[PDB]
């Protein structure tokens, strides 16, 4: 399923992508505007990879709580950015993922300049937490997002793979 195809995408990718996220469409009925508003949210994700005391104690606590649920290394900023991304949703058109979907286009921010210089808060935070490259690629039922601590430039070879692995 989705996680499998997310791992597939970056375990064959041309360059070194740190993670991959599928933002998934849904519809909630706002009775005020009468609009069946389209929203992007966490569908699935795959992290591949490569602070201070108050920070690391906070993160380690969260990790063992999830471990308690499912079932002590330090938590890198990229692992942590990946995880906190589960909390985020995007109304159609809004934010890096929502712009990509609404306009059916690829948005490629390459280099730390691009990320902070974009004015997208998600890209900015991404730079803060070690990312150098952020890409959103719209598919049929959502958006595939790739991130990397390295700097990667627009390969059609990537957009090729994504088109294949998703309808």
Partner 1 sequence: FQKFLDRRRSFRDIQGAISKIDPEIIKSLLAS
Task: Write the CB contacts of 14 (distance below 8 Å, at least 6 apart in sequence).
Answer: 155, 157, 158
**Least distance from C-beta 71 to partner 1, angstroms?**
6
Residue owning tokens 């059609």: 156
Does 52 bind partner 1 (CB under 8 A)? Our answer is no
Nearest residue to 99 (alpha-carbon basis) of 81, 123, 78, 116? 123
Task: Write the CB contacts of 51 (distance below 8 Å, at least 6 apart in sequence).
Answer: 59, 74, 75, 77
- What are the tokens at 13? 């990718």
Residues 104-163 that bind partner 1 (CB under 8 A): none
By rule CB under 8 A, what count of residues binds partner 1?
A: 27
- For residues 64 to 83, the per-residue mask of contacts with partner 1, x marking binding by CB under 8 A and - elsewhere, is -xxx-xxx-x-x---x--xx
Does 39 bind partner 1 (CB under 8 A)? Our answer is no
Provide the binding-site residues for partner 1, judged by CB under 8 A: 3, 41-42, 44-47, 49, 58, 61-63, 65-67, 69-71, 73, 75, 79, 82-84, 86-87, 89
């Amino acid at each position: 399923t989705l996680q499998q195809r997310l791992q597939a995408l970056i375990e064959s990718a041309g360059e070194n992508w740190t993670y991959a996220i599928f933002w998934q469409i849904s519809h909630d009925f706002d009775s005020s505007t009468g609009d069946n508003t389209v929203i992007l949210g966490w569908g699935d994700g795959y992290y591949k990879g490569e602070t201070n005391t108050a920070e690391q104690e906070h993160r380690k606590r969260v990790i063992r709580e999830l471990n308690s649920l499912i079932s002590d290394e330090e938590v890198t900023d990229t692992e942590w950015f990946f995880l906190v991304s589960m909390t985020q949703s995007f109304v159609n058109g809004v934010g890096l993922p929502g712009e990509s979907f609404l306009n059916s286009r690829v948005i490629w921010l390459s280099g730390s300049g691009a990320l902070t210089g974009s004015g997208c808060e998600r890209a900015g935070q991404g730079q803060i937490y070690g990312l150098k490259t952020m890409v959103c690629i719209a598919t049929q039922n959502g958006v595939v997002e790739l991130g990397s601590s390295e700097v990667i430039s627009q390969s059609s070879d990537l957009m090729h793979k994504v088109n294949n692995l998703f309808n």
